Design a protein around this ligand. Structure first.
Ligand SMILES: Nc1cc(O)cc(-c2nc(N3CCOCC3)c3sccc3n2)c1
Lengths: 277, 1013
C-alpha cells in the first residue's frame, strides 16, 4: 500500500513551493514535523526534506542517480516514498547520529480537505468570501483599537511627566516656606517687641498667600493623578479588547488560507479569487 | 505647548516670583520680555513687599523654574524671552547661582538637541549606563585630536568634507560625454564690496586637482615664465566653492570624482565654481573646545566552563496581565535560549494556569550544558494566552529578552524582575528574539519575576587565551591539518558554489557538515565566512572555540559582505568585531553615508551599550560633519521609542558633547521642526472641521509672528546641511490636500551665487504619516541607480531627498518643474503631446530617450521592491522627459496579508499612454523598434540588480528591528528573493520577469517571439 504510492499523491510532497512557504508551515511546530519540496532549480539535487529538530528547521537534500535516491553516496532507496517511509519508522541517527529523530508528523497538502468538507467550487468560494469579510472586519476593529492604544500611551506619558513637574513645583514652593520660616523667626521675634503689628500683618499676609498657592498646586497635581488613573485603566481595557481579538484573527486568517488553498487546487481562475476576496 | 496646556500666552500675564527673603511677588509681565527686563520689573515692585532691606542687586541673582520636561532649569542666558523658556507653570524663583556655569549651559543645549534632560542619565542606577557615559568619552577626545592634528586644514575638512564618490575611475559612458576627456567649467570671482560678479571660463582635464583648477583661473597680457612664481606662492591663497552651496573642494581629489562635478556632466550643465580666499574660510571656522564633563570578604570568582550543571531558570509569577477571564482560557510563560534568531535548545513552556492567577513557581529545565552556552546567548520569553473540536490559538500578551551574560561577561544569577514590552503590530510569533534586551522602563507594565541559578559569587565567561587552549585540545581528539590533507578539485568547486548562495538561502545539513569538515580550507575563499558561521554548532563550546581561532586570523572581506555579519543572525562579539574591522579598513566616507540608515539600525541588535560598531560610527560622525549630521537625525527621529530611548539618548549626548559648533546649528534645526510639529498638531486637532482657506489664514498669522520668523529662517536644511534655508517666501507656503495636512514650505537660498544653482528651496513638511518606508525605498533607488551607472546602463532615476525626523514626522525634497500624470491627462495621446510641446524642436529625441530610460528603471525597481500600486497621482513627469515616482507608502508587498494572494504583482503597469510616448506617437506602440529596445533596457537592468542581490538582502536584514511593519521578519525580506528569482537560474529569472510583465500587461508586453513575418 505505502511504498507503491506515487510521489505526486504523497501527502508530504508539495512540489515547487518556495523555501519560505515551507518555513511558514514549520514555524514553531513540534520535533518530527516535516515535508518535502522540489530543490532549487539552480542547485544540485532533486528534492529537499525539511524537518524540525531542537526548535529548528533542518534541510536535507535528496539526490538521484540511476534509479536510486539518498542523502549521500551510496544512493540506496528505490524511490522518495521509500526513503521517507523508512525514516517515518526509523531514526535519522542511522544517517547522522547528530539528529536522532523520526519523521513523525507530515504536513499534509490534503489538510484543508479535512476542514473544508464541501465539494462544490462556488460553495467553497462563497465561504472564502464570508471568512475574508469577517477577517477584514476584525482586522479593522483591531487597527482602530491599536490606534487608540498608541494615542493613549502618548497621553499617559505626557501626564506622567506633568506629575513630575508638579512634584518639582511643590518641592520648590515647599522650600520657600522653609526659607520664610528661617528668616521670619529672627525678624518677627524682634518686631513683636516695639509693638509693630503692621509688620507682622504684612509678613503673615504674604506667608498665607504662599500657603494659599501651595494648596492650589497640590490640588492641581491631585486632579491630574485621578485623570492618570482613569486613562491608565482605559489603556489596560484597550489592551484586554485587543487580546480577545488576536486569537479570533489568527483562526480567521488560517481558515481563510485553507479555503484559498482548496481553490488553488482544482485550478480556479485568479479573477474568481479576487472577486471573492 | 510652551506653557502647560497652552500653545502660547498673551503678552500680559502674571508670574509668581519667589524671592530669597521668603516673599512671593505676583508680577505683571510681558511675554516678549527677556529675563533681566522681568528682573527689572520684579525688583522695582519688590520695594513694596516686606524685607526689601534684605535683597542684593539684580546682577547678584538668577531665575530658576520647572520646565515641560520636569527639569529644575537655571536660566543663565538672560536674553532668552519668556515663551522660549518652556515653563511648566508661570513662576520664577531667584537664587544665588552655584556650580559650573559653562557646564550647565552646555547640558541644557545638549538636552534641547536630544529631546530629554541630561540629568535623567545621572539617575540611572544601571552600571552599564554609567560606564558607557564615562568610557565613550575616549572616542570623543580621540576624535577631536584627529581633526586638530594637521590644523587648520583638518579643521576645515571636518566642517566641509569633500563630497566625493568612492572611486576615481570614471565609467566609459561618463567619460564619452566629455569633449576629448575635458570639461568646460566656469570659475566666478567677486570684485569687492560692489559685488558686480565676474567669470573666468576654463577648459581643463577632468582629473585636475583643485590646485590645478585654481592655477588655470589666474591665467584666464603679462609675462609667461613668471607664472611659476604665483602658482607656487599663491596656490594656498584660494580654495574652490560650489555656487549656491556650502560645499568646498578642499582635498586633492580628481575634479570628476566630486559629486557635483559628476552630476554636472550627466545633466549637461555648466559647473559653476566660485573662487574664494582660503584665509576667509579658515579664520571663519569656530576652533571649538571639547571639555570633559563632571561625570568623568573576597569575591569567589569562577569560570563558566567549571560549572558541571545543566541550564535551568525559575519562572515565579507575573504581577498582572490584561486579559478578559471570560474569553481567554489559560495563560503560561513561553521561554527560549537563543543565539540571535536560532534556538540553542528546545523552547520550554511553564504549566498552564488561570488568567486571574499568573503564578507558576517552577524550574524550567533546558537540554543544554552550562559550559556550552555561547557568549551571545539570550533568554527570550513571553506571557502567552490560550483560547480553545479540540483546537486552540496561542497569542503573545507581552514579551522580553535578557542577556545570559552581562556587559562584563558575568553570567546572570538569582532573582530578577523583567517588565515586559507590548507585542509589535503584526507579530503573531509567540517569542520576539529580534527585539531589544533589558527591562521596560515604564513600571506600570506586566512584570515577570524569575530566578536564575546561583553557583558562585561571580561566574565569568573565559578569556580568549583559555578558549584557544580548549580549541587546540578539541581538535586533537577529533581524528596543521589545514595542509595535512589536500583540498580536492571536486571539494574546491562545491565550496565556491556554496559561497555564491545569497544570505537567506539556507545551507543544507550536508552542506553544514561539508563546510565544517573543510573549515581550515575555507580561509582561501574568505567570502564564505557567513556560510561557515551558519555551519557551526553554536550550542557546543568545542566547535565555537575552534571558530574563534579561525575568525582571529580571517582575511578581511569587502564592506558590503561584512554588513551581512552585522544583522541579527550573527550576534557573536568576535564575528561582529571582525565585521567592524572590515569597515574600519575598507569603508569609505561616501559608502558610510550611503549605508548610514542601516548601520544606525544595527545598534538595536547589539547586546550592550558599549561595542565596537558604536565606537566606529561615533568616531566617523565626529570626524565628518556630513556623517555626523545624519547620524544625529537618524538617532533623534526614534527618541520617542522607549525600546531605544536610553541607548540613542546616551549616544546622542556623546555626539553633542564632542561635535563642537554644529550643536548650535542642530539646535536651530530642532527648534524649527518643533515649531512646525506644534502648528501641524493644532491644525489636526483644533482646526479639523475648518476649511483649507481658514487653516491657511491661521497658519499665515502664526507664521508671521517674530518668534516663528526667527526660528523658521536662517538655518540649515535637515535634508542637506549644505543647503542653507534663508527667509521664508511665506506668501507661497501652502497646506497640501492630504488628510494629515502637509506643509509645502518655501525658503530663499541666501547664497551670494544662488541664481546659478537655485534661488529658492522647496520642502514638504509632513506630520501624520510614517516616512521611514519612503526614506528606505528612496535610498534603495539611489543604490540601484549607482549599480546601473557603473555597469554602463544610463537609466536615470530620481531619488529625491527624504528624511524621517521624528515619530511619523519627516521632510521631502520638492523636485522643480515636476507634474503628475493626472494633471497632464485631465485620450491616450495627451501625455506624448505634452512632452512634445515641452521639448518641441530638435531636442525631442533626447527627451523621449530620457523618458524611456526613466520608465525602464522605475519599471524594474518597483517590480523588485513590490511598492504600492502606481496610479496617475503617484507617477510624475518633468519638463525634460524624466519620469519618476512618489509616495511609495509600503513595500515588499505588505498588503499580501489582509488578502489571500501569494502572487508577485507589478506596481507600475505601462498603460497605452506611456507606450505611445516610448514609440514616438506610433499606433501599434507594443511592436515598434523603440519598445523592443525599451524591453532590453528593462532586462539588462533586472539582471544587474540580481547580480548585486546580496547587498539589498543585507541592507533589509539590518532593518528588521526598526519597528517598521513591512520589515518584521526574514519572511518579509524574502519577497525580493522571489522577484529577483534567486533560487532560479539567471536565464530562468529572465523568463520569470518576462512572464510577470506579460501577465500584468494583458498580452501587451511582447514576448521574445517577435514576428519579422
Ligand atoms: N506621502 C508622500 C510621500 C512622498 O515621498 C512624496 C509625496 C508627494 N511628493 C510630491 N513631490 C513634490 C515634487 O518633488 C517630489 C515630491 C508631491 S506633489 C503633489 C503631491 C506630492 N506628494 C507624498
Amino acid at each position: 500500500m505505502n511504498n507503491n504510492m506515487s510521489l505526486q499523491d504523497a501527502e508530504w510532497y508539495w512540489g515547487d513551493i518556495s523555501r519560505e512557504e515551507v518555513n511558514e508551515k514549520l514555524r514553531d511546530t513540534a520535533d518530527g514535523t516535516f515535508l518535502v519540496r522540489d530543490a532549487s532549480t539552480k542547485m544540485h539535487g532533486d528534492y529537499t526534506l525539511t524537518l524540525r529538530k531542537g526548535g529548528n528547521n533542518k534541510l536535507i537534500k535528496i539526490f538521484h542517480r540511476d534509479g536510486k535516491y539518498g542523502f549521500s553516496d551510496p544512493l540506496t532507496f528505490s524511490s522518495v516514498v521509500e526513503l521517507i517511509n523508512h525514516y517515518r519508522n526509523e531514526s535519522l541517527a542511522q544517517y547522522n547520529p547528530k539528529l536522532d529523530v523520526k519523521l513523525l508528523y507530515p504536513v499534509s497538502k490534503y489538510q484543508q480537505d479535512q476542514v473544508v468538507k464541501e465539494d462544490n467550487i462556488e460553495a467553497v468560494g462563497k465561504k472564502l468570501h464570508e471568512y475574508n469579510t469577517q477577517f477584514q472586519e476584525k482586522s479593522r476593529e483591531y487597527d482602530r483599537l491599536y490606534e487608540e492604544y498608541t494615542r493613549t500611551s502618548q497621553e499617559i506619558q505626557m501626564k506622567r511627566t506633568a506629575i513630575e513637574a508638579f512634584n518639582e513645583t511643590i518641592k520648590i514652593f515647599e522650600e520657600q516656606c522653609q526659607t520664610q520660616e528661617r528668616y521670619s523667626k529672627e525678624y518677627i521675634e524682634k518686631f513683636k517687641r516695639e509693638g509693630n503689628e503692621k509688620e507682622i500683618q504684612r509678613i503673615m499676609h504674604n506667608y498665607d498667600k504662599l500657603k494659599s498657592r501651595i494648596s492650589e498646586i497640590i490640588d492641581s497635581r491631585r486632579r491630574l493623578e485621578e485623570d492618570l488613573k482613569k486613562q491608565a485603566a482605559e489603556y489596560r481595557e484597550i489592551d484586554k479588547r485587543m487580546n480577545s481579538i488576536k486569537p479570533d484573527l489568527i483562526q480567521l486568517r488560517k481558515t481563510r488560507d485553507q479555503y484559498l488553498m482548496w481553490l488553488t487546487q482544482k485550478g480556479v481562475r485568479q479573477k474568481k479569487l479576487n472577486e471573492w476576496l | 505647548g510652551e506653557l502647560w496646556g497652552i500653545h502660547l500666552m498673551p503678552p500680559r500675564i502674571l508670574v509668581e516670583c519667589l524671592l530669597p527673603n521668603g516673599m512671593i511677588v505676583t508680577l505683571e509681565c510681558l511675554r516678549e520680555a527677556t529675563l533681566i527686563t522681568i528682573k527689572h520689573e520684579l525688583f522695582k515692585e519688590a520695594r513694596k513687599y516686606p524685607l526689601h532691606q534684605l535683597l542684593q542687586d539684580e546682577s547678584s541673582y538668577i531665575f530658576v523654574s520647572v520646565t515641560q520636561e520636569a527639569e529644575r532649569e537655571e536660566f543663565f542666558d538672560e536674553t532668552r524671552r519668556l515663551c522660549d523658556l518652556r515653563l511648566f507653570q508661570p513662576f520664577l524663583k531667584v537664587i544665588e547661582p552655584v556650580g559650573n556655569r559653562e557646564e550647565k549651559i552646555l547640558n541644557r543645549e545638549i538636552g534641547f538637541a536630544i529631546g530629554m534632560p541630561v540629568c535623567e542619565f545621572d539617575m540611572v542606577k544601571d552600571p552599564e549606563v554609567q560606564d558607557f557615559r564615562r568610557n565613550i568619552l575616549n572616542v570623543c577626545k580621540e576624535a577631536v585630536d584627529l581633526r586638530d592634528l594637521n590644523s587648520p586644514h583638518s579643521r576645515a575638512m571636518y566642517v566641509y568634507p569633500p563630497n566625493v564618490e568612492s572611486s576615481p575611475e570614471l565609467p566609459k559612458h561618463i567619460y564619452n560625454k566629455l569633449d576629448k576627456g575635458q570639461i568646460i567649467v566656469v570659475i566666478w570671482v567677486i570684485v569687492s564690496p560692489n559685488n558686480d560678479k565676474q567669470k573666468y571660463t576654463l577648459k581643463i582635464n577632468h582629473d585636475c586637482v583643485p590646485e590645478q583648477v585654481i592655477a588655470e583661473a589666474i591665467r584666464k597680457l603679462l609675462s609667461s615664465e613668471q607664472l611659476k612664481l604665483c602658482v607656487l606662492e599663491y596656490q594656498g591663497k584660494y580654495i574652490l566653492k560650489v555656487c549656491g552651496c556650502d560645499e568646498y573642494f578642499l582635498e586633492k581629489y580628481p575634479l570628476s570624482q566630486y559629486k557635483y562635478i559628476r552630476s554636472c556632466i550627466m545633466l549637461g550643465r555648466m559647473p559653476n565654481l566660485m573662487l574664494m580666499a582660503k584665509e576667509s574660510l579658515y579664520s571663519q571656522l569656530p576652533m571649538d573646545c571639547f571639555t570633559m564633563p563632571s561625570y568623568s570578604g573576597e569575591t569567589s570568582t569562577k569560570s563558566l566552563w567549571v560549572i558541571n550543571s545543566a541550564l535551568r531558570i525559575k519562572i515565579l509569577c507575573a504581577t498582572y496581565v490584561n486579559v478578559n477571564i471570560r474569553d481567554i482560557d489559560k495563560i503560561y510563560v513561553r521561554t527560549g535560549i537563543y543565539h540571535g534568531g536560532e534556538p540553542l535548545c528546545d523552547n520550554v513552556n511553564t504549566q498552564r494556569v488561570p488568567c486571574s492567577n499568573p503564578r507558576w513557581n517552577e524550574w524550567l529545565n533546558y537540554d543544554i550544558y552550562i559550559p556550552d552556552l555561547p557568549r551571545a546567548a539570550r533568554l527570550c520569553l513571553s506571557i502567552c494566552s490560550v483560547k480553545g473540536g479540540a483546537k486552540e490559538e496561542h497569542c503573545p500578551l507581552a514579551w522580553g529578552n535578557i542577556n545570559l551574560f552581562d556587559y562584563t561577561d558575568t553570567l546572570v544569577s538569582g532573582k530578577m524582575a523583567l517588565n515586559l514590552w507590548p507585542v509589535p503590530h503584526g507579530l503573531e510569533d509567540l517569542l520576539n528574539p529580534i527585539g531589544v534586551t533589558g527591562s521596560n522602563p515604564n513600571k506600570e507594565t506586566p512584570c515577570l519575576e524569575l530566578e536564575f541559578d546561583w553557583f558562585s559569587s561571580v561566574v565569568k565567561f573565559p578569556d580568549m587565551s583559555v578558549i584557544e587552549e580548549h580549541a587546540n585540545w578539541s581538535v586533537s581528539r577529533e581524528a596543521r591539518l589545514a595542509r595535512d590533507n589536500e583540498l580536492r578539485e571536486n571539494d574546491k568547486e562545491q565550496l565556491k558554489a556554496i559561497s555564491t548562495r545569497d544570505p537567506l538561502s539556507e545551507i543544507t545539513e550536508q552542506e553544514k557538515d561539508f563546510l565544517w569538515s573543510h573549515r581550515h580550507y575555507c580561509v582561501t575563499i574568505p567570502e564564505i565566512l557567513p556560510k561557515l558561521l551558519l555551519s557551526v554548532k553554536w550550542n557546543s563550546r568545542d566547535e565555537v572555540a575552534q571558530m574563534y581561532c579561525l575568525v582571529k586570523d580571517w582575511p578581511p572581506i569587502k564592506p558590503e559582505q561584512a554588513m551581512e555579519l552585522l544583522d541579527c543572525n550573527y550576534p557573536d562579539p568576535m564575528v561582529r568585531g571582525f565585521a567592524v574591522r572590515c569597515l574600519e579598513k575598507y569603508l569609505t566616507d561616501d559608502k558610510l553615508s550611503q549605508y548610514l540608515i542601516q548601520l544606525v539600525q544595527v545598534l538595536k541588535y547589539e547586546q550592550y551599550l558599549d561595542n565596537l560598531l558604536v565606537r566606529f560610527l561615533l568616531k566617523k560622525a565626529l570626524t565628518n560633519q556630513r556623517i555626523g549630521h545624519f547620524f544625529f537625525w537618524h538617532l533623534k527621529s526614534e527618541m520617542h521609542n522607549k525600546t531605544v530611548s536610553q541607548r540613542f539618548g546616551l549616544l546622542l549626548e556623546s555626539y553633542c558633547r564632542a561635535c563642537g559648533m554644529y550643536l548650535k546649528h542642530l539646535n536651530r534645526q530642532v527648534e524649527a521642526m518643533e515649531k512646525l510639529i506644534n502648528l501641524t498638531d493644532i491644525l489636526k486637532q483644533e482646526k479639523k472641521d475648518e476649511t483649507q482657506k481658514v487653516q491657511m489664514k491661521f497658519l499665515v498669522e502664526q507664521m508671521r509672528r517674530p518668534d516663528f520668523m526667527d526660528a523658521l529662517q536662517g538655518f540649515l536644511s535637515p535634508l542637506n546641511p549644505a543647503h542653507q534655508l534663508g527667509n521664508l517666501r511665506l506668501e507661497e507656503c501652502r497646506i497640501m490636500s492630504s488628510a494629515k495636512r502637509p506643509l509645502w514650505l518655501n525658503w530663499e537660498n541666501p547664497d551670494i551665487m544662488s541664481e546659478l544653482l537655485f534661488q529658492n528651496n522647496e520642502i514638504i513638511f509632513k506630520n501624520g504619516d510614517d516616512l521611514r518606508q519612503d526614506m528606505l525605498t528612496l535610498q534603495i533607488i539611489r543604490i540601484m541607480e549607482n549599480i546601473w551607472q557603473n555597469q554602463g546602463l544610463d537609466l536615470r532615476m530620481l531619488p529625491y531627498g527624504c528624511l524621517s525626523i521624528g515619530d511619523c514626522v519627516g521632510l521631502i525634497e520638492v523636485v522643480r518643474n515636476s507634474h503628475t500624470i493626472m494633471q497632464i491627462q485631465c485620450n491616450s495621446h495627451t501625455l506624448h503631446q505634452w512632452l512634445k510641446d515641452k521639448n518641441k524642436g530638435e531636442i525631442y529625441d533626447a527627451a523621449i530617450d530620457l523618458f524611456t530610460r526613466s520608465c525602464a528603471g522605475y519599471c524594474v525597481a518597483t517590480f523588485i521592491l513590490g511598492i504600492g500600486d502606481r496610479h496617475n497621482s503617484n507617477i510624475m513627469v518633468k519638463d525634460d522627459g524624466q519620469l519618476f515616482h512618489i509616495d511609495f507608502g509600503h513595500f515588499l508587498d505588505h498588503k499580501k496579508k489582509k488578502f489571500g494572494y501569494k502572487r508577485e504583482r507589478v506596481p507600475f503597469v505601462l498603460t497605452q499612454d506611456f507606450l505611445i510616448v516610448i514609440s514616438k506617437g506610433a499606433q501599434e506602440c507594443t511592436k515598434t523598434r523603440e519598445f523592443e529596445r525599451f524591453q532590453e533596457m528593462c532586462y539588462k537592468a533586472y539582471l544587474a540588480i540580481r547580480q548585486h542581490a546580496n547587498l539589498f538582502i543585507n541592507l533589509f536584514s539590518m532593518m528588521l528591528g526598526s519597528g517598521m511593519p513591512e520589515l518584521q521578519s526574514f519572511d518579509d525580506i524574502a519577497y525580493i528573493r522571489k522577484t529577483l528569482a534567486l533560487d532560479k537560474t539567471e536565464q530562468e529569472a529572465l523568463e520569470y520577469f518576462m512572464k510577470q510583465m506579460n501577465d500584468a500587461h494583458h498580452g501587451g508586453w511582447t514576448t521574445k517571439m517577435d514576428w519579422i513575418f
